[PDB]
Structure 1
Protein backbone atom coordinates (compact mmCIF):
# COMPACT_ATOMS: atom_id res chain seq x y z
CA UNK A 1 0.00 0.00 0.00
CA UNK A 2 2.41 2.66 1.30
CA UNK A 3 6.21 3.13 1.42
CA UNK A 4 8.18 1.53 4.28
CA UNK A 5 7.03 2.63 7.71
CA UNK A 6 3.93 4.60 6.66
CA UNK A 7 0.35 4.18 7.87
CA UNK A 8 -2.95 6.05 7.66
CA UNK A 9 -4.31 7.93 10.68
CA UNK A 10 -7.21 10.21 11.62
CA UNK A 11 -6.75 13.73 12.98
CA UNK A 12 -8.42 14.07 16.40
CA UNK A 13 -8.88 17.84 15.98
CA UNK A 14 -10.08 18.00 12.37
CA UNK A 15 -11.25 14.50 11.43
CA UNK A 16 -9.21 14.44 8.23
CA UNK A 17 -6.97 11.52 7.33
CA UNK A 18 -3.21 11.96 7.55
CA UNK A 19 -0.12 9.79 7.21
CA UNK A 20 2.38 8.82 9.89
CA UNK A 21 5.72 7.00 9.65
CA UNK A 22 6.55 4.93 12.73
CA UNK A 23 10.24 4.64 11.78
CA UNK A 24 10.93 8.35 11.24
CA UNK A 25 8.06 9.79 13.34
CA UNK A 26 7.21 11.98 10.34
CA UNK A 27 3.61 13.04 9.86
CA UNK A 28 1.94 14.86 6.96
CA UNK A 29 -1.43 15.39 5.30
CA UNK A 30 -0.33 14.31 1.82
CA UNK A 31 -0.12 10.67 0.72
CA UNK A 32 3.54 9.55 0.84
CA UNK A 33 5.32 9.35 -2.51
CA UNK A 34 6.39 6.26 -4.44
CA UNK A 35 17.51 0.91 -0.52
CA UNK A 36 20.81 2.68 -1.23
CA UNK A 37 24.12 1.55 0.18
CA UNK A 38 24.65 5.00 1.69
CA UNK A 39 22.75 8.13 2.66
CA UNK A 40 23.85 11.63 3.59
CA UNK A 41 22.02 13.34 6.44
CA UNK A 42 22.13 16.41 8.64
CA UNK A 43 20.69 16.48 12.13
CA UNK A 44 19.80 18.75 15.03
CA UNK A 45 20.32 17.13 18.42
CA UNK A 46 18.75 18.25 21.69
CA UNK A 47 20.36 16.56 24.68
CA UNK A 48 18.79 16.14 28.10
CA UNK A 49 19.63 15.04 31.62
CA UNK A 50 19.43 11.33 30.72
CA UNK A 51 21.59 11.60 27.60
CA UNK A 52 24.60 9.28 27.54
CA UNK A 53 26.80 12.40 27.90
CA UNK A 54 24.77 15.33 29.35
CA UNK A 55 27.28 17.87 27.99
CA UNK A 56 27.83 19.73 24.73
CA UNK A 57 29.54 22.73 23.18
CA UNK A 58 26.45 24.77 24.14
CA UNK A 59 26.39 23.74 27.82
CA UNK A 60 28.93 22.15 30.17
CA UNK A 61 26.16 20.43 32.17
CA UNK A 62 22.87 19.80 30.39
CA UNK A 63 20.05 19.76 32.92
CA UNK A 64 16.86 19.95 30.84
CA UNK A 65 14.44 17.06 31.18
CA UNK A 66 13.64 14.63 28.36
CA UNK A 67 10.15 16.15 28.18
CA UNK A 68 11.66 19.64 27.87
CA UNK A 69 13.99 18.42 25.12
CA UNK A 70 11.05 16.94 23.22
CA UNK A 71 9.22 20.26 23.51
CA UNK A 72 12.23 22.12 22.08
CA UNK A 73 12.44 19.59 19.24
CA UNK A 74 8.73 19.93 18.50
CA UNK A 75 9.07 23.72 18.35
CA UNK A 76 12.00 23.57 15.93
CA UNK A 77 10.01 21.25 13.68
CA UNK A 78 7.08 23.70 13.73
CA UNK A 79 9.27 26.63 12.67
CA UNK A 80 10.95 24.57 9.93
CA UNK A 81 7.60 23.44 8.55
CA UNK A 82 6.11 26.94 8.60
CA UNK A 83 9.16 28.41 6.88
CA UNK A 84 9.90 30.80 9.75
CA UNK A 85 13.30 29.14 10.18
CA UNK A 86 15.57 26.98 8.05
CA UNK A 87 16.80 23.62 9.32
CA UNK A 88 20.43 24.59 8.72
CA UNK A 89 20.14 27.81 10.73
CA UNK A 90 18.52 26.08 13.71
CA UNK A 91 21.08 23.26 13.62
CA UNK A 92 23.97 25.73 13.59
CA UNK A 93 22.56 27.67 16.55
CA UNK A 94 20.94 25.05 18.74
CA UNK A 95 22.18 21.51 18.02
CA UNK A 96 23.99 19.91 20.97
CA UNK A 97 26.12 17.99 18.43
CA UNK A 98 29.46 19.48 17.38
CA UNK A 99 28.25 18.93 13.79
CA UNK A 100 26.40 22.21 14.41
CA UNK A 101 29.51 23.89 13.03
CA UNK A 102 28.75 22.27 9.63
CA UNK A 103 25.04 23.19 9.66
CA UNK A 104 24.33 19.74 11.08
CA UNK A 105 25.85 17.81 8.16
CA UNK A 106 27.15 14.34 9.08
CA UNK A 107 28.34 13.39 5.60
CA UNK A 108 27.49 10.05 4.03
CA UNK A 109 27.24 6.82 5.97
CA UNK A 110 26.27 3.15 5.66
CA UNK A 111 24.21 0.82 7.80
CA UNK A 112 26.09 -0.39 10.86
CA UNK A 113 27.74 2.97 11.72
CA UNK A 114 25.13 5.05 13.60
CA UNK A 115 22.92 4.26 16.58
CA UNK A 116 20.09 2.03 15.41
CA UNK A 117 17.06 4.39 15.73
CA UNK A 118 19.04 7.07 13.92
CA UNK A 119 20.16 4.68 11.17
CA UNK A 120 16.65 3.28 10.67
CA UNK A 121 15.12 6.74 10.37
CA UNK A 122 17.88 7.97 8.06
CA UNK A 123 17.39 5.09 5.63
CA UNK A 124 13.56 5.34 5.71
CA UNK A 125 13.62 9.02 4.69
CA UNK A 126 13.48 9.86 1.01
CA UNK A 127 16.02 12.33 -0.32
CA UNK A 128 14.94 15.77 0.87
CA UNK A 129 12.61 14.45 3.60
CA UNK A 130 12.81 15.35 7.30
CA UNK A 131 12.01 13.14 10.30
CA UNK A 132 9.97 13.83 13.38
CA UNK A 133 11.58 13.39 16.81
CA UNK A 134 13.97 10.42 16.74
CA UNK A 135 15.15 9.11 20.11
CA UNK A 136 18.63 7.69 20.75
CA UNK A 137 20.87 7.30 23.78
CA UNK A 138 22.39 10.66 22.84
CA UNK A 139 19.14 12.59 23.01
CA UNK A 140 16.41 13.57 20.56
CA UNK A 141 17.17 14.24 16.89
CA UNK A 142 15.62 15.95 13.88
CA UNK A 143 17.13 14.26 10.80
CA UNK A 144 17.23 15.76 7.28
CA UNK A 145 18.18 13.43 4.44
CA UNK A 146 20.18 15.37 1.84
CA UNK A 147 21.42 12.55 -0.46
Structure 2
Protein backbone atom coordinates (compact mmCIF):
# COMPACT_ATOMS: atom_id res chain seq x y z
CA UNK A 1 0.00 0.00 0.00
CA UNK A 2 1.33 3.41 -1.05
CA UNK A 3 -0.36 6.79 -0.87
CA UNK A 4 -0.74 8.67 -4.16
CA UNK A 5 -2.21 11.88 -5.48
CA UNK A 6 -2.64 12.68 -9.17
CA UNK A 7 -3.34 15.37 -11.71
CA UNK A 8 -5.49 14.23 -14.64
CA UNK A 9 -5.53 16.01 -17.99
CA UNK A 10 -8.30 14.63 -20.18
CA UNK A 11 -8.69 14.69 -23.94
CA UNK A 12 -11.58 14.28 -26.39
CA UNK A 13 -11.01 10.55 -26.86
CA UNK A 14 -11.43 9.44 -23.22
CA UNK A 15 -14.67 7.68 -22.29
CA UNK A 16 -15.93 10.64 -20.21
CA UNK A 17 -14.46 13.76 -21.80
CA UNK A 18 -15.82 16.21 -19.24
CA UNK A 19 -14.09 17.75 -16.23
CA UNK A 20 -15.25 16.51 -12.85
CA UNK A 21 -13.07 18.92 -10.86
CA UNK A 22 -14.82 21.56 -8.70
CA UNK A 23 -13.15 24.41 -10.60
CA UNK A 24 -14.89 23.65 -13.90
CA UNK A 25 -17.30 20.79 -13.26
CA UNK A 26 -19.09 19.84 -16.47
CA UNK A 27 -16.66 21.57 -18.83
CA UNK A 28 -16.57 19.51 -22.03
CA UNK A 29 -13.04 18.37 -22.93
CA UNK A 30 -12.33 18.81 -26.65
CA UNK A 31 -8.49 18.96 -26.74
CA UNK A 32 -6.63 16.31 -28.69
CA UNK A 33 -4.62 13.53 -27.10
CA UNK A 34 -1.48 15.34 -28.26
CA UNK A 35 -2.70 18.54 -26.63
CA UNK A 36 -3.22 16.70 -23.30
CA UNK A 37 0.28 15.21 -23.43
CA UNK A 38 1.82 18.58 -24.16
CA UNK A 39 -0.17 20.23 -21.41
CA UNK A 40 0.76 17.60 -18.82
CA UNK A 41 4.40 17.97 -19.85
CA UNK A 42 4.29 21.74 -19.36
CA UNK A 43 2.51 21.71 -15.99
CA UNK A 44 5.13 19.26 -14.73
CA UNK A 45 8.21 20.78 -16.34
CA UNK A 46 7.51 24.34 -15.16
CA UNK A 47 8.90 22.96 -11.87
CA UNK A 48 11.53 20.58 -13.29
CA UNK A 49 14.18 21.87 -10.86
CA UNK A 50 12.35 19.94 -8.14
CA UNK A 51 13.88 16.64 -7.09
CA UNK A 52 10.87 16.02 -4.88
CA UNK A 53 7.75 18.09 -4.32
CA UNK A 54 5.96 18.92 -1.12
CA UNK A 55 2.29 17.98 -0.89
CA UNK A 56 1.35 21.67 -1.06
CA UNK A 57 3.39 22.06 -4.25
CA UNK A 58 1.65 19.15 -5.93
CA UNK A 59 -1.83 20.21 -4.77
CA UNK A 60 -1.18 23.57 -6.44
CA UNK A 61 -1.04 21.93 -9.84
CA UNK A 62 -4.07 19.75 -9.01
CA UNK A 63 -6.04 22.88 -8.12
CA UNK A 64 -4.94 24.67 -11.30
CA UNK A 65 -5.13 21.85 -13.85
CA UNK A 66 -6.68 18.54 -12.76
CA UNK A 67 -9.91 17.48 -14.44
CA UNK A 68 -10.46 14.42 -12.22
CA UNK A 69 -13.17 14.23 -9.58
CA UNK A 70 -10.38 13.56 -7.09
CA UNK A 71 -9.64 17.29 -7.34
CA UNK A 72 -12.48 17.75 -4.81
CA UNK A 73 -9.97 16.42 -2.27
CA UNK A 74 -6.94 18.07 -3.87
CA UNK A 75 -6.16 15.00 -5.96
CA UNK A 76 -5.90 12.46 -3.15
CA UNK A 77 -6.23 8.85 -4.33
CA UNK A 78 -5.63 7.43 -0.84
CA UNK A 79 -3.82 4.15 -0.34
CA UNK A 80 -3.41 1.99 -3.45
CA UNK A 81 -2.22 -1.62 -3.67
CA UNK A 82 -0.19 -2.57 -6.75
CA UNK A 83 -2.20 -4.52 -9.34
CA UNK A 84 -5.40 -2.57 -8.72
CA UNK A 85 -5.28 0.22 -11.29
CA UNK A 86 -4.55 -0.23 -14.99
CA UNK A 87 -1.04 -1.56 -15.72
CA UNK A 88 0.10 1.73 -17.26
CA UNK A 89 -0.72 3.69 -14.12
CA UNK A 90 0.38 1.01 -11.71
CA UNK A 91 3.88 0.52 -13.13
CA UNK A 92 4.75 4.24 -13.09
CA UNK A 93 3.13 4.82 -9.69
CA UNK A 94 5.05 2.01 -7.97
CA UNK A 95 8.33 3.20 -9.52
CA UNK A 96 8.15 6.51 -7.64
CA UNK A 97 10.22 7.30 -4.58
CA UNK A 98 8.71 9.27 -1.69
CA UNK A 99 7.87 12.81 -2.79
CA UNK A 100 8.51 12.20 -6.48
CA UNK A 101 6.20 13.25 -9.32
CA UNK A 102 6.04 11.00 -12.38
CA UNK A 103 6.52 11.94 -16.00
CA UNK A 104 3.22 12.10 -17.86
CA UNK A 105 1.62 8.65 -17.97
CA UNK A 106 -1.37 7.83 -20.08
CA UNK A 107 -4.36 5.61 -19.41
CA UNK A 108 -7.94 5.37 -20.69
CA UNK A 109 -8.78 8.21 -18.29
CA UNK A 110 -6.35 10.71 -19.79
CA UNK A 111 -2.83 11.86 -19.04
CA UNK A 112 -1.70 11.64 -15.41
CA UNK A 113 1.00 13.14 -13.26
CA UNK A 114 1.35 10.84 -10.26
CA UNK A 115 2.73 11.94 -6.90
CA UNK A 116 3.87 9.64 -4.11
CA UNK A 117 3.08 11.23 -0.74
CA UNK A 118 5.50 8.95 1.08
Q: How many residues align?
A: 109
1:107 corresponds to 2:74: no
**What is the deviation of 1:109?**
1.0
Larger Rg: 1
Give the number of the structure whose residues are more often strand, by fraction.
1
The match for 2:27 is 60
The match for 2:46 is 79
5+ unaligned residues in a row in structure 2: which ranges? Answer: 51-55
5+ unaligned residues in a row in structure 1: which ranges? Answer: 1-37
Instruction: State the TM-score, normalized to the length of structure 2.
Output: 0.83
1:49 corresponds to 2:12: yes
**What is the deviation of 1:82?**
4.3
- Secondary structure in 2 matching 1:143: strand
- Secondary structure in 2 matching 1:77: helix
1:132 corresponds to 2:95: no
Q: Which one has more relative contact order, counting CA pairs under 8 Å at least 6 apart?
A: 2
Instruction: State the TM-score, normalized to the length of structure 1.
Output: 0.68
